[PDB]
Design a protein around this ligand. Structure first.
Ligand SMILES: N[C@@H](CCC(=O)O)C(=O)O
Ligand SMILES: N[C@@H](CCC(=O)O)C(=O)O
Ligand SMILES: N[C@@H](CCC(=O)O)C(=O)O
Lengths: 183, 183, 183
């Protein structure tokens, strides 16, 4: 099976501010030596559902994986909601190896004492758009294997950062396509 | 067969202003649960071939599909010009099911009375560049399943929108890569 | 075999200013009628390793290919460092046909006397980010089949161009994903 995903529904699965306040829509499709990824994020409740002038314009969604490529429970994304695809849902077996979906550790090494700043290639940076409004850019930073916490073997994080005042709006962004080299 | 396309030639196939004034180059390659898409647009004749100060800085190219995934004749793209790949041309059979290329209706639901504003994930927004000149951004908005007209089951639309004055120039943009979840 | 790459290590393989001053990380994965590509560039030594106020804010990395799809020795990328994937390295056979990885000559024709300016679809233009810092955009231009020198049959070039003063910094950019139609 060649896709890992959250499912495409809008049932909350993720933490932006508080637990299960948001829907991360994420699909990872294996394409040989790369995964083709597609991501977006919606705030369903809580502060990011109706932002204020003081809301933090920087949200990080962390997916931490063990050595089998299985999501760790300390991730921002709930495990209930994350598995191999089956129709528009997921497979019933909870604990399925997924090393071939993990980001390559040579391309994207964990940070170390060896070399201070890590390679910029460990990140993808671009813009997505809040509310699908062209005048409302939000910077998406995708980082590969740059987390060490909770004993993780691999990581994929999605950070959204912006400068303009989006108060009174619901955080919701356009979809973003990306790829990365696999283990 | 795993690619639907316009063919890569420059024979006009599309309407920007008037019928068959432009070449839409579009390739959809099936990659499991995603299509990998690649698009660009060129004006061959008519107003967008030599824009004026009053030309509309907003062009929408609509591909409408029936429940079989087959292009409807009311689309901006001519059907003559759109089919499964065979060499650098298309297959001879005109009417081939293509549901596995269609955008997923759970990820990208049609608009309804149920929920006012639709999910931003139904769109991709980025920049492409007019004339391949780095100082001439044009915003591309790709939208999935957001059309209802003509009884369509699915839709993919490409809107190009800009602010700067590109008068006297030919509309022609750099290629854009994207993906989406499939039915 | 469905991936051509540089390998994901940081051993210098490329010329920005002087020979083997930099690491081009490039992976081309065949996906039917498209290649899914992923690129980034790091300066390891020389001027781009510690830029000055006079360093040229325009670097072109040229991959030139023969009619078999094999890299020509006059390319910016060293051939030693470029082959079909095998684990995290490359296959031992040096000279492997790769026409199915080459950019389509109908979609991306070489430049000619026939039609002055070439089609903008021959290029992809976007931003990547120096040092993975969101305030440091660098424009990446990918061009397909636009070189004629050294008798090349095909070409893929990566040009990085910028305006801001990045003096004292090491040239290093975030990863960029793209696709193109294949021969
Ligand atoms: N890196 C994979 C093998 C290559 C791949 O599946 O992409 C593994 O370590 O299991
Ligand atoms: N959604 C497809 C099945 C899954 C796929 O082909 O991507 C169908 O409805 O026919
Ligand atoms: N263009 C290929 C055939 C199609 C493909 O492999 O993508 C060739 O000329 O050998």
């Amino acid at each position: 099976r060649r896709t890992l995903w959250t499912t495409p529904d809008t049932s909350p699965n993720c933490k932006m501010s508080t637990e299960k306040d948001s829907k991360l829509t994420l699909t990872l499709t294996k394409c040989g030596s790369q995964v083709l990824g597609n991501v977006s994020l919606l705030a369903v409740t809580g502060e990011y559902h109706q932002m204020t002038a003081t809301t933090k314009k920087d949200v990080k969604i962390s997916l931490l994986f063990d050595e089998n490529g299985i999501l760790l429970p300390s991730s921002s994304l709930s495990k209930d909601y994350w598995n191999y695809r089956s129709d528009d849902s997921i497979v019933s077996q909870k604990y399925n190896n997924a090393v071939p979906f993990m980001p390559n550790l040579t391309a994207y090494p964990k940070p170390s004492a060896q070399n201070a700043k890590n390679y910029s290639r460990t990140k993808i940076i671009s813009n997505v758009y809040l509310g699908a409004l062209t005048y409302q850019p939000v910077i998406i930073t995708i980082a590969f294997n740059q987390e060490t916490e909770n004993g993780c073997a691999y990581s994929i994080t999605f950070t959204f950062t912006w400068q303009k005042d989006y108060s009174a709006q619901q955080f919701d962004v356009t979809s973003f396509t990306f790829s990365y080299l696999t283990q």
